[PDB]
Amino acid sequence: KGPKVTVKVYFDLRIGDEDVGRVIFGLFGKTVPKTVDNFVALATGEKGFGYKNSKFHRVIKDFMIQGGDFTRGDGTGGKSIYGERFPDENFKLKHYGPGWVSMANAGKDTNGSQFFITTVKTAWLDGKHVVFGKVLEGMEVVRKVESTKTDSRDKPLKDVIIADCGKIEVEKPFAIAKEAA
Amino acid sequence: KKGPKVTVKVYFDLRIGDEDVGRVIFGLFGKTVPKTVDNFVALATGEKGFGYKNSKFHRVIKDFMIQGGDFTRGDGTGGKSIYGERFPDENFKLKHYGPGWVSMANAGKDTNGSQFFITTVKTAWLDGKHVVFGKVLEGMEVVRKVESTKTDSRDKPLKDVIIADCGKIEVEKPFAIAKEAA
Amino acid sequence: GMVTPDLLFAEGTAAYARGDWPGVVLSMERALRSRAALRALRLRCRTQCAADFPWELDPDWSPSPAQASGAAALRDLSFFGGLLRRAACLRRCLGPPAAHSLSEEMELEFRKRSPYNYLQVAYFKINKLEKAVAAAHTFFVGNPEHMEMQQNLDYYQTMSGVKEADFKDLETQPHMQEFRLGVRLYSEEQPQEAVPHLEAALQEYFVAYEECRALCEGPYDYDGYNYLEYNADLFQAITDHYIQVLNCKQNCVTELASHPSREKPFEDFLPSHYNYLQFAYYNIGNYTQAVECAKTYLLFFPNDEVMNQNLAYYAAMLGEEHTRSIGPRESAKEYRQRSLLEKELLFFAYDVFGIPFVDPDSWTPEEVIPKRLQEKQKSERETAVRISQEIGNLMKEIE
Amino acid sequence: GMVTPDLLFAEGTAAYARGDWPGVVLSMERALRSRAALRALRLRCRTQCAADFPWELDPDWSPSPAQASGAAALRDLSFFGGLLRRAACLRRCLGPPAAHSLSEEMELEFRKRSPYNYLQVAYFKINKLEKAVAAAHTFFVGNPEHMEMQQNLDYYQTMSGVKEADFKDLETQPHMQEFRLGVRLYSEEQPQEAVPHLEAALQEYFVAYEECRALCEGPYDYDGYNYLEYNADLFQAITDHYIQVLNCKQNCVTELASHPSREKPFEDFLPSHYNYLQFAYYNIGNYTQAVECAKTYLLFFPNDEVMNQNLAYYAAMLGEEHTRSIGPRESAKEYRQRSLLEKELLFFAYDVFGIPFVDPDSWTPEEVIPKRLQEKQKSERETAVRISQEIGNLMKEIE
Amino acid sequence: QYERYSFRSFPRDELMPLESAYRHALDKYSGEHWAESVGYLEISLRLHRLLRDSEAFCHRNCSAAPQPEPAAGLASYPELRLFGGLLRRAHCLKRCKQGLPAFRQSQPSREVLADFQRREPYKFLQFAYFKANNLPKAIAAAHTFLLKHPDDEMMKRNMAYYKSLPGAEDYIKDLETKSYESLFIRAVRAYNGENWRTSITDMELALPDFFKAFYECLAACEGSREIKDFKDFYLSIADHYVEVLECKIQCEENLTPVIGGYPVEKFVATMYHYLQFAYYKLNDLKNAAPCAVSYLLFDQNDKVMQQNLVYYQYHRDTWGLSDEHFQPRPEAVQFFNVTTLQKELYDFAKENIMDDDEGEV
Amino acid sequence: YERYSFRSFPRDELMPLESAYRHALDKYSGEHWAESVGYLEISLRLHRLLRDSEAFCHRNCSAAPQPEPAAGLASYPELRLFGGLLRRAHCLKRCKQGLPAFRQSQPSREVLADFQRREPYKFLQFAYFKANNLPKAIAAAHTFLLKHPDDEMMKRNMAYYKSLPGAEDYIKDLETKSYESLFIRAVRAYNGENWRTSITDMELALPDFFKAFYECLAACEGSREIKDFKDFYLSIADHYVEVLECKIQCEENLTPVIGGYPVEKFVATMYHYLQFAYYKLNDLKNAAPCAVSYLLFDQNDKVMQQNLVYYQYHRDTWGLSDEHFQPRPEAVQFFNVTTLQKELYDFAKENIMDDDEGEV
């Protein structure tokens, strides 16, 4: 069996110039509430502050590409729309390889507004990080960006920019198999 | 005709699998090495909030040694001392002389934790790297029993060896013991 | 009943930090309505579900003297069928589960009455002085260690049009406001007007106890990241969760007796009500009520010499037959019995499983405590007094 | 006895993790007291013992030209007998030797003022907000890149019960606070109250230097496991340990001249004291102390044009007799002479034994450096200027 | 591997944590040291069966045990009586689990038990036996593995290879067997031979053993889970029971004997039918009627047996047969109640309490 | 050995001691008598050369005349003392660099401990016995027995060798010291009443013994294995306490061995012999210094004090003006050195040394 997707949120990335493409996300709207609505509201830009012109700071090779911290690019901030933090709901799903998004926390019930992404099947991160999505198209874009040259701080030398981050509506919840991407 | 001085004793009671195998009585040198002895006694008694009780001997090398004392993780990487995570080694006034002598085990310079030895053969090459702080006065047949248990490749014993009981005993007058084997 | 309160409060803060006073006042009002709507929904749903599918116990069922294998299975199936009926009803009529949970810091900001701060500032700006003094006085009652609020209240009172009748709280439960008002009216020798407030205090106390018994059937709490290795059985998880729920229900008798203006919870809450009632009815002239209330007090503490003397005086002046025919209150009897049974069960669980528990009352007899943990309790009291003395000595050394 | 600080700090952090606020506050207060108690004990015992058995040589002992053998044995016996007496007094007075040692992580954390963090949190949670704000300010001055502590401090200031005259530090020595305060007051042009703070700063600086030179005799530091193959003689181990001790004594003039807030240690610490004192004295109305401080500053630096012009100006306004009667301070004489002798000894040891030494001051005359080291430094300067001109030529080629 | 096995008396020299012995056996296997790997794999299987027996035993001194009943002052509060009884049962479990040899060592995780119940170790076993020239036990272990997993590919080729070689052609036997399987086999085999008394004896010996095994397998399934959601009280002590109910439902199809590559359908009904026919052939109608009524109870829609009871009712008054002699035996009624109640409870629980958030595609 | 000297060592022989010992042991395992014996001889030559070089270095560094100190340092004594110590250490390093024997690999201290216990001498004597080199075997056995005279098989070998006539011609020490031979010559001269010859032997035995004693005393400042990491003053005090323990034994080891039991108080006894010889020659003017030296060394003698009473009854008869009652400076210096060593060690033993090792 497989979980159901409700909405699609599409990012349009660019490496300084000559944009790479568009990365679609399908968000599990019925499995995990209180984390999908936060993400869509942050993306579409309805509360003023949003994801537009973010920066993927940690681009660790074949581990993750974090990001989403819109306040400052240091990588230890970010405020949601549910106050500042909010708690974890339920880890009904686990990390099944490349393409399975999550939420990045600094402890217990310390969810903010920062991404996760996987590139290899991680098993020691199941039961700590809530999962709320799974990439659908454009995984080649992720594979391309994860190869950029970084210093010994994982921050890429060439800045990556989310030029657009909108919201795409789906008229029917369709399930997706849980293999990879 | 010269020997160090015992000030306090610490005694164990062990289970090997499903059978009780008796008692081990350590004599600890408080005059020569006071810091390590105080740490070991405060861990054995366990009044601080944690201790050696119900831990296990997680390495047994035939004709070389038996090592245990890790209670946090149990596989050979944990162990927190009463003095924080790690504290430096005090002094090396004593050596390893053969079977029965108990010292501390560290994973680098000045990194003493909560994992001890009990040597079984003369251990010259480990002289000046590990802080000897006691000798097994009575009950060496129990260590001989523990050493020959069947072990797998990692040398963790196939069965489980458990420190089922661990307490301390007071010595009202320090008495000196020789510097021989056993 | 509405969108989550935390989102509304965050929007109100963001709007207030840029000078949009209508927006902040509207958002704060909406949040303060939503929280109460949510709590009322939970209370009503839980009470209705509990009362619509009751626990149909079957003491008439003697399972089997001869057979022993299937009878336990039949009993388990019937009990869990009833449980499944209750759970289905609850899940259907509670609604969405997202709105019913919120962060802990949000509860902290909703217990310090911060929205009342934002509302008083914005309502002073809007020139709505009545709804400004209301919010300012409510916040000040909420935190009595803010003399800035005191000078703000002085600045508001200097302006004309302020009414004394508008000094309302709008936040504290009635069973505490009525009690404090009754004791204040009593302290100055006004027994005639003292009784109604205290009687309403008892009525509202029993209603509030019934309302607060059905509000810690909440999620189980774990020791941080200890739920990754939680490996307990079915009849162990059931008993663990029920023990914690009983701990909630028995520790919700020290929360009904705490006012933020007082740094310590009231000592002997409810027997004190009865004591004041008997004294008031003594002073008035109604003496049957005085003897009834004195007796209902004695039932809680049967070893009080002074109140025994008072009861002897009341009986001596009155008729013996009337005093003998009059007995304790009924609701007090039921409250005492149910609390005693819960305490007995919790103490047994403490003795066997090893789950801590601190008695929230003083009338508890000695027969319910096992003769094994009293040693530990006085030991911990010794450590507490030693720590207090040592802190005092450290303070003395610092000087 | 006085228990160790690491044990108390570990107990405090454990009790903080469990959640007992009185325990953690008491434990960290005890740790911060015992560390300074141990330091004071070391300083007092060391200074007193070393000052009770002096090093004076025998006036009656004379070189022996005829017998060239026995004199050496007698000299060594006398010197090492004096050394034995000193070591006996030290060993008897100091006490247990184990307490005075603790690991690198604990020293590194005690340098960053973590017990003040735990203490401010616990004092907020025990409602003693005065000491909470004091500890908050102590931490905040200790670490300048902590914005959350800034928010905490602002909340405390806005919170009632907090004033502006209660802001203390409790950690920095007076010789730094007084200098910073003097330079701040002098910045706002108040010369009337800018001399006394600098007088106190000077005197406390000399006291602190004398006190903290005597805490440099410490255990020899072997790199890794190099003590297994260390095979030095007696009269070479003594010189090795004493050269290291002299190095650690001379690297004590760059530890007093730095502050946790400032990123880089101050330049010209003590000549700056004299310069600012000269400016303040000239502005106030003192001329005698103005010219005296100008002359004292000239003693350290022999080529400063501005101070030469100031001295000439004051000689013009005052009399030549007044300038010639008043001379430099005695403290500068002693400090300069002692430091120059130590530098000469250490430079000779570097020249022969090859033990490195980087100069921690800029007022050292160039004649103390030997010929070989002077030639090496000249070659280094030549290659540095060659690299600089190569970089300039490369940038020109870029253009 | 199962010859020198006795739960009540287990040799103290073969009591070690299960995961350690299993990992030792696998590591010895990968190093091509057969005999030691064979010994330690057999030890791991014995220890797994011992652990299962210990759990199924300790989970039955608590349920089937009498309990006190408090006074009326506690009898008027059912919400306290029920959970007090549950507290007493939890205490009885926690006290009876301390004292058994199999529980004082270090317990294994869930994945190792999943592999063991998947019957995976037998794979290695068969290969190991063919590398110690133990071909009969090799084919026995290969066939035992294939019996539970008939969809395999490599094992089918290996079994073809073993069957092709002579010598091992009548050693096809299971090694995970119970008493009632072989007892029913003997009963059917003797019934085909028209030998009657042995058939009735075998059936009356088979019935209690099957019911005992079924009730043990039901009461051993109240196990733990992995926490994956944080919900209320009534919604978390009534969602563990749904998984437990799935486990209890998938507990009658695992106990049915399999013969000739085909499982037996309606096991209990068939066994009662054989009992009824064996009774009738002896002209002993005293106890024949209750078996017929039990078969009707289990299989409501029949033709031959309905005619049989019609024929019985026509001559009910000549054998001295009473109406109370026509009631089904109590154990069959208990079995029917339990199965029907569990099925209908799952039918009610897969309509409301389960969430609708998962799809197939 | 007279087959080499301090300034006559060959070039090929400058090879590491440890390699020589190891190859010699290998050859001894191979029964190759000539190779093993010759290489052991080379090893012993190397050991004696190392001892001579170390002694010369440590007796030329300390005996260096003190240069003129600066003036400004007269008010800071600690810096003065440690600056002088630094100068001495640098001079030691230079002088040790100047000698060839220290340019090779330094053997471990356990090899030195074995050499001091004369372990190679047993192997040498066993090789000689296997080679039928009887006189050298007796010489090696006599050399070895001075440290372990209770050896049973050594006693059997000695008895068997003494069974053959003339074995007393082969009893001798390979490492006999010059002052011992000169003292033996002095005793023989005294026995034969040849007073005129004995004075020369005594006057050649005094300076040589003093030189040997001071060399062995001042060459004791050596290494030490680091057991505890201590403070500055305490660590140096422990170092010097161990050096003192090694130092106070020189007057015991240097005692001559005559007749199987050492002669107590070599210097004092020889001074008494000199006084007796002077009295026999009626040279009391030079006998009085010997008498006062004997009193200074040995005051516990009543016969001596009554002898000086008899001397002082009519001391003016011979014509002494008290100048002869002043003791010789060397005796006073030796007495001061020994007294200071013993008193310092007693003080250090009572007050400084740690008491954490017990009896039994």
Ligand SMILES: *[C@@H]1O[C@H](CO)[C@@H](O)[C@H](O)[C@H]1NC(C)=O
């Ligand atoms: C006392 O009060 C009760 C009700 O509060 C009333 O029924 C009764 O008549 C009163 N008794 C007297 C003597 O007034």
Ligand SMILES: *[C@@H]1O[C@H](CO)[C@@H](O)[C@H](O)[C@H]1NC(C)=O
């Ligand atoms: C200069 O300042 C000093 C302060 O120590 C004061 O004593 C003196 O009077 C001042 N000079 C004059 C001329 O007053």
Ligand SMILES: *[C@@H]1O[C@H](CO)[C@@H](O)[C@H](O)[C@H]1NC(C)=O
């Ligand atoms: C378990 O059952 C047996 C069967 O009679 C009984 O003897 C024993 O007491 C029971 N154990 C417990 C703990 O009740």
Ligand SMILES: *[C@@H]1O[C@H](CO)[C@@H](O)[C@H](O)[C@H]1NC(C)=O
């Ligand atoms: C079991 O089912 C039978 C059907 O014949 C009926 O009596 C009742 O539902 C159950 N009986 C008992 C005793 O539980």
Ligand SMILES: *[C@@H]1O[C@H](CO)[C@@H](O)[C@H](O)[C@H]1NC(C)=O
């Ligand atoms: C010691 O060294 C110096 C410098 O060479 C010099 O006195 C002499 O050569 C050596 N020997 C003696 C006895 O001084």
Ligand SMILES: *[C@@H]1O[C@H](CO)[C@@H](O)[C@H](O)[C@H]1NC(C)=O
């Ligand atoms: C030598 O010893 C004598 C007597 O023991 C003593 O008077 C003198 O001070 C000592 N030292 C010297 C240099 O003579």
